[PDB]
Paper text:
[name] is a multi-domain kinetochore protein specific to kinetoplastids, such as [name]. We recently reported the X-ray structure of the [name] C-terminal region, showing that it has a tandem [name] (BRCA1 C Terminus) domain fold.
We have confirmed that in solution the [name] domain binds phosphate ion in the sulfate ion binding site previously identified by X-ray crystallography. Mutating the residues involved in phosphate ion binding in [name] [name] [name] results in growth defects confirming the importance of the [name] phosphopeptide-binding activity in vivo.
Numbering used by the authors: 474 to 520, 525 to 616, 628 to 645
């Protein structure tokens, strides 16, 4: 978060549809209350992503299925601090200056992926992430771990 302490850069005025992933109950409620308190066209949506999703709140790097789906569908991935800092500033801050992540255009789109791992929940989840991003799983990018898929996704264009 490298905002200016004098004139912190404002985010665009536009609806923000927040979801959270893998937060504690406590910090999810604090994020909810802060979104509700600032308002300014933002709402917290309840739980794969709700179709109205623009922003995913998560602590740390993308790890959950919801977070990876956000990575590959050009959602903003922001830390809880994005919400609290914006409430402190009095308006929604610029997502990029706050350190938020967004990968546009959708990486994986029209890309083909060979998942060199055995069958199981992890392979199934990665297939769903690939498809959610508009990619196809080969029944040209070889992936042996979710980590490798994430590094591909954040390093395009």
């Amino acid at each position: 978060r490298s905002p200016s302490p004098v004139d912190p850069k404002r985010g665009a005025v536009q609806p923000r549809y927040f979801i959270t992933t893998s937060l504690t109950e406590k910090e999810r409620n604090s994020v909810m209350e802060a979104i509700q308190k600032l308002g300014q066209r933002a709402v917290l949506v309840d739980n794969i992503l709700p179709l109205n999703t623009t922003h995913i709140v998560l602590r740390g790097p993308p790890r959950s299925v919801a977070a990876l789906c956000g990575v590959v569908s050009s959602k903003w991935l922001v830390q809880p601090s994005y919400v609290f800092d914006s409430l402190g500033a009095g308006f929604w801050l610029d997502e990029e200056v706050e350190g938020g992540l967004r990968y546009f255009p959708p990486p994986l789109r029209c890309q083909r992926f060979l998942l060199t791992m055995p069958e199981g929940v992890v392979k199934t989840m990665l297939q769903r992430v690939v498809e959610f991003g508009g990619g196809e799983v080969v029944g040209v990018v070889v992936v042996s771990s979710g980590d490798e898929l994430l590094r591909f996704a954040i390093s395009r264009d």
